[PDB]
Write a protein that holds these residues in place. Structure first.
Motif, PDB file in Angstrom:
ATOM      1  N   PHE A  40      36.564  20.956  49.434  1.00 51.79           N
ATOM      2  CA  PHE A  40      37.565  22.009  49.524  1.00 51.79           C
ATOM      3  C   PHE A  40      38.706  21.617  50.448  1.00 51.79           C
ATOM      4  CE2 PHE A  40      35.227  24.602  46.899  1.00 51.79           C
ATOM      5  CZ  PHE A  40      33.900  24.607  47.288  1.00 51.79           C
ATOM      6  N   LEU A  41      39.821  22.317  50.285  1.00 56.53           N
ATOM      7  CA  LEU A  41      41.001  22.131  51.113  1.00 56.53           C
ATOM      8  C   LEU A  41      41.175  23.345  52.009  1.00 56.53           C
ATOM      9  CD1 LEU A  41      43.515  20.802  48.463  1.00 56.53           C
ATOM     10  CD2 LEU A  41      41.966  19.516  49.950  1.00 56.53           C
ATOM     11  N   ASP A  42      41.447  23.097  53.287  1.00 59.58           N
ATOM     12  CA  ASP A  42      41.841  24.159  54.217  1.00 59.58           C
ATOM     13  C   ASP A  42      43.356  24.352  54.130  1.00 59.58           C
ATOM     14  OD1 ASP A  42      42.097  21.567  55.311  1.00 59.58           O
ATOM     15  OD2 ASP A  42      41.669  22.252  57.350  1.00 59.58           O
ATOM     16  N   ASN A  43      43.791  24.777  52.949  1.00 62.92           N
ATOM     17  CA  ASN A  43      45.204  24.842  52.598  1.00 62.92           C
ATOM     18  C   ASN A  43      45.767  26.235  52.846  1.00 62.92           C
ATOM     19  OD1 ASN A  43      43.866  26.174  50.504  1.00 62.92           O
ATOM     20  ND2 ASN A  43      45.144  25.323  48.889  1.00 62.92           N
ATOM     21  N   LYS A  44      47.085  26.347  52.700  1.00 65.05           N
ATOM     22  CA  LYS A  44      47.711  27.653  52.776  1.00 65.05           C
ATOM     23  C   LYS A  44      47.331  28.467  51.548  1.00 65.05           C
ATOM     24  CE  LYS A  44      48.514  29.594  55.203  1.00 65.05           C
ATOM     25  NZ  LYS A  44      47.377  30.523  55.475  1.00 65.05           N
ATOM     26  N   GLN A  45      46.979  29.726  51.769  1.00 59.93           N
ATOM     27  CA  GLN A  45      46.616  30.617  50.683  1.00 59.93           C
ATOM     28  C   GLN A  45      47.868  31.102  49.965  1.00 59.93           C
ATOM     29  OE1 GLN A  45      44.466  32.953  53.766  1.00 59.93           O
ATOM     30  NE2 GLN A  45      42.793  32.990  52.265  1.00 59.93           N
ATOM     31  N   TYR A  46      47.702  31.427  48.682  1.00 54.54           N
ATOM     32  CA  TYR A  46      48.820  31.927  47.889  1.00 54.54           C
ATOM     33  C   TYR A  46      49.277  33.298  48.373  1.00 54.54           C
ATOM     34  CZ  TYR A  46      51.476  33.662  43.925  1.00 54.54           C
ATOM     35  OH  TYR A  46      52.469  34.213  43.129  1.00 54.54           O
ATOM     36  N   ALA A  92      36.397  28.261  42.883  1.00 57.74           N
ATOM     37  CA  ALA A  92      36.095  28.767  44.220  1.00 57.74           C
ATOM     38  C   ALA A  92      37.252  28.514  45.175  1.00 57.74           C
ATOM     39  CB  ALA A  92      34.806  28.148  44.752  1.00 57.74           C
ATOM     40  N   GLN A  93      37.880  27.337  45.077  1.00 56.87           N
ATOM     41  CA  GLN A  93      39.081  27.056  45.856  1.00 56.87           C
ATOM     42  C   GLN A  93      40.168  28.073  45.548  1.00 56.87           C
ATOM     43  OE1 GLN A  93      39.724  24.054  48.001  1.00 56.87           O
ATOM     44  NE2 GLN A  93      41.344  25.465  48.641  1.00 56.87           N
ATOM     45  N   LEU A  94      40.436  28.311  44.265  1.00 61.22           N
ATOM     46  CA  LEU A  94      41.489  29.256  43.916  1.00 61.22           C
ATOM     47  C   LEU A  94      41.153  30.666  44.386  1.00 61.22           C
ATOM     48  CD1 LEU A  94      42.610  27.819  40.521  1.00 61.22           C
ATOM     49  CD2 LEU A  94      44.016  28.124  42.541  1.00 61.22           C
ATOM     50  N   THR A  95      39.878  31.057  44.311  1.00 62.23           N
ATOM     51  CA  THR A  95      39.495  32.401  44.741  1.00 62.23           C
ATOM     52  C   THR A  95      39.790  32.608  46.220  1.00 62.23           C
ATOM     53  OG1 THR A  95      37.846  32.706  43.011  1.00 62.23           O
ATOM     54  CG2 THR A  95      37.583  33.989  45.031  1.00 62.23           C
ATOM     55  N   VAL A  96      39.392  31.656  47.063  1.00 60.10           N
ATOM     56  CA  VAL A  96      39.665  31.810  48.486  1.00 60.10           C
ATOM     57  C   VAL A  96      41.141  31.639  48.803  1.00 60.10           C
ATOM     58  CG1 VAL A  96      37.297  31.272  48.978  1.00 60.10           C
ATOM     59  CG2 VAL A  96      39.047  29.444  49.174  1.00 60.10           C
ATOM     60  N   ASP A  97      41.896  30.995  47.921  1.00 54.72           N
ATOM     61  CA  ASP A  97      43.347  30.939  48.020  1.00 54.72           C
ATOM     62  C   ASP A  97      44.021  32.199  47.487  1.00 54.72           C
ATOM     63  OD1 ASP A  97      43.674  28.530  49.325  1.00 54.72           O
ATOM     64  OD2 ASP A  97      43.479  27.384  47.454  1.00 54.72           O
ATOM     65  N   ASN A  98      43.233  33.175  47.025  1.00 51.62           N
ATOM     66  CA  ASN A  98      43.743  34.443  46.486  1.00 51.62           C
ATOM     67  C   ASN A  98      44.609  34.241  45.245  1.00 51.62           C
ATOM     68  OD1 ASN A  98      42.321  36.114  48.300  1.00 51.62           O
ATOM     69  ND2 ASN A  98      43.964  35.973  49.830  1.00 51.62           N
ATOM     70  N   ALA A 158      39.872  34.479  56.675  1.00 47.75           N
ATOM     71  CA  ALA A 158      39.964  33.224  55.939  1.00 47.75           C
ATOM     72  C   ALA A 158      38.637  32.474  55.981  1.00 47.75           C
ATOM     73  CB  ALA A 158      41.092  32.358  56.499  1.00 47.75           C
ATOM     74  N   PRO A 159      38.396  31.632  54.973  1.00 49.88           N
ATOM     75  CA  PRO A 159      37.172  30.812  54.977  1.00 49.88           C
ATOM     76  C   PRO A 159      36.950  30.029  56.257  1.00 49.88           C
ATOM     77  CG  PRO A 159      38.252  30.627  52.867  1.00 49.88           C
ATOM     78  CD  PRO A 159      39.132  31.521  53.701  1.00 49.88           C
ATOM     79  N   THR A 160      38.008  29.467  56.847  1.00 49.37           N
ATOM     80  CA  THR A 160      37.817  28.692  58.068  1.00 49.37           C
ATOM     81  C   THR A 160      37.257  29.563  59.180  1.00 49.37           C
ATOM     82  OG1 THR A 160      40.145  28.976  58.690  1.00 49.37           O
ATOM     83  CG2 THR A 160      39.554  26.986  57.439  1.00 49.37           C
ATOM     84  N   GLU A 161      37.713  30.815  59.278  1.00 54.57           N
ATOM     85  CA  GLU A 161      37.172  31.699  60.306  1.00 54.57           C
ATOM     86  C   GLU A 161      35.744  32.129  59.984  1.00 54.57           C
ATOM     87  OE1 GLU A 161      36.751  33.594  63.806  1.00 54.57           O
ATOM     88  OE2 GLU A 161      38.442  32.329  63.206  1.00 54.57           O
TER      89      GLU A 161
HETATM   90  C1  LIG Z   1      40.856  27.742  52.336  1.00 58.09           C
HETATM   91  C2  LIG Z   1      41.397  28.225  53.670  1.00 58.09           C
HETATM   92  O1  LIG Z   1      40.680  28.701  54.473  1.00 58.09           O
HETATM   93  N1  LIG Z   1      42.805  28.091  53.945  1.00 58.09           N
HETATM   94  C3  LIG Z   1      43.319  28.569  55.208  1.00 58.09           C
HETATM   95  C4  LIG Z   1      43.311  27.501  56.297  1.00 58.09           C
HETATM   96  C5  LIG Z   1      44.228  27.988  57.403  1.00 58.09           C
HETATM   97  C6  LIG Z   1      43.871  28.789  58.467  1.00 58.09           C
HETATM   98  N2  LIG Z   1      44.968  29.005  59.185  1.00 58.09           N
HETATM   99  C7  LIG Z   1      46.038  28.367  58.620  1.00 58.09           C
HETATM  100  C8  LIG Z   1      47.401  28.281  59.000  1.00 58.09           C
HETATM  101  C9  LIG Z   1      48.283  27.549  58.224  1.00 58.09           C
HETATM  102  C10 LIG Z   1      47.829  26.897  57.082  1.00 58.09           C
HETATM  103  O2  LIG Z   1      48.717  26.160  56.312  1.00 58.09           O
HETATM  104  C11 LIG Z   1      46.499  26.966  56.708  1.00 58.09           C
HETATM  105  C12 LIG Z   1      45.606  27.722  57.495  1.00 58.09           C
END
Ligand SMILES: CC(=O)NCCc1c[nH]c2ccc(O)cc12
Ligand SMILES: CC(=O)NCCc1c[nH]c2ccc(O)cc12
Ligand SMILES: *[C@@H]1O[C@H](CO)[C@@H](O)[C@H](O)[C@H]1NC(C)=O
Length: 345
Positions: free
Chosen positions: A181-187, A246-252, A190-193
């Motif tokens: 998965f990518l910890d990317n910006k959501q559309y 699953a990636q797209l879902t958490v990206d909303n 958050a998953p990381t938290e």
């Molecule tokens: C899948 C997922 O959790 N994405 C969010 C990761 C995330 C947490 N804070 C952020 C702040 C800026 C950003 O570009 C991404 C994040």
């Protein structure tokens, strides 16, 4: 069919304290062992886990597990369904720890639930050694979704465990399906938290080299494939849809220009993270489908199926550089879901 064995060490438990276990079909003429980690999200606090216990209880307890399961896809013993490893010893390890296979915490008077995923894997391995795993030449630790991330978190620990127990000849390898998965910006926001909170709730453990890079409090980074993979010593083959559901879902994301650019950028970023992953299979599809599905043979990248790519990977790991007509790095370059005609319908 694969037959259930509850762990003889009944202190290695599912979330509710019931024994964990594994389903096994032995193949006495084979020195290959496939240990597959089931997926199924996770839970990260008391209230969230209580909800999962009411409507996803098989993922938290063995009390209602069936005596058998049928092996499908890469777990099938039929060569027509499984061109890759149909003759292997097959092990399905149910996911009943809700911790992405990372936990090492028992139930106690302070803990309503046990999170023992990392210990479940080690105990399965230990008990299998007496059932023929001691004679293995290859142990492939595979898994899908949370189980795919579980492979990344645990493959080197299995390798270390077998070495310390006195089995240096067993080659441990990983196959991580749909857990990259990518910890990317959501559309939209958050998953990381949730992972951060989960790790503390579970006493979650990550591979030591990755832990040492990111240091205390930052272990969540090691749940992201592109960050943990470079720290691993065992060979790992990565399977990941470029547009994983699953990636797209958490990206909303559930098509105007903003969303088009978002989706194209996601595929490009996923592709980029796999550029230095020499054994990988990443089709340009929007899918939640996984490698234990019966029709897993159907998808191809550049004209090569996943069973073929896995076979080529086996060849590449022979004791004796690239193989003619037998590729192992297969990543689609086309930029939109289903631009590959072999994507699952
Ligand atoms: C899948 C997922 O959790 N994405 C969010 C990761 C995330 C947490 N804070 C952020 C702040 C800026 C950003 O570009 C991404 C994040
Ligand atoms: C789908 C998602 O949230 N990915 C980001 C967090 C994450 C990392 N590894 C995982 C494995 C299973 C899972 O359900 C979520 C994650
Ligand atoms: C059972 O597993 C636990 C946790 O891994 C371990 O502490 C204990 O020693 C094991 N018991 C036996 C009898 O091996």
């Amino acid at each position: 069919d694969l037959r259930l064995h509850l762990l003889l060490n009944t202190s290695v438990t599912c979330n509710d304290g019931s024994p964990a276990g594994y389903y096994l079909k032995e193949s006495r003429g084979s020195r290959r062992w496939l240990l597959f980690l089931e997926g199924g999200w996770y839970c990260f606090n008391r209230e969230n886990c209580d909800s999962r216990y009411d409507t996803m209880r098989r993922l938290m307890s063995s009390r209602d597990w069936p005596r058998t399961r049928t092996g499908t896809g890469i777990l099938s013993s039929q060569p027509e369904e499984n061109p890759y490893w149909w003759n292997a010893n097959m092990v399905f390890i149910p996911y009943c720890s809700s911790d992405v296979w990372s936990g090492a915490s028992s139930k106690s008077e302070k803990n309503e639930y046990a999170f023992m995923g990392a210990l479940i894997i080690q105990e399965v391995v230990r008990e299998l050694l007496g059932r023929g795993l001691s004679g293995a030449k290859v142990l492939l630790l595979a898994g899908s979704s949370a189980g795919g991330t579980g492979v990344l978190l645990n493959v080197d620990r299995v390798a270390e465990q077998l070495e310390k127990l006195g089995y240096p000849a067993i080659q441990v390898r990983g196959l991580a399906d749909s857990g990259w998965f990518l910890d990317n910006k959501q559309y939209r926001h958050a998953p990381t938290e949730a992972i951060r909170r989960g790790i503390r709730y579970w006493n979650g453990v990550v591979p030591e080299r990755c832990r040492r890079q990111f240091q205390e409090g930052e272990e969540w980074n090691c749940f992201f494939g592109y960050k943990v993979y470079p720290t691993l010593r065992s060979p790992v083959f990565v399977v990941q849809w470029l547009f994983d559901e699953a990636q797209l879902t958490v990206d909303n994301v559930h098509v105007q220009e903003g969303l088009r650019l978002y989706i194209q950028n996601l595929g490009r970023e996923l592709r980029h993270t796999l550029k230095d992953v020499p054994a990988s299979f990443a089709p340009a599809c929007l899918s939640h489908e996984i490698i234990i599905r019966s029709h897993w043979t159907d998808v191809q990248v550049k004209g090569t199926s996943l069973p073929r790519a896995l076979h080529c990977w086996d060849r590449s790991l022979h004791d004796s550089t690239p193989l003619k007509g037998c590729p192992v790095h297969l990543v689609d370059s086309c930029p939109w879901p289903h631009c590959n005609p072999s994507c699952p319908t």
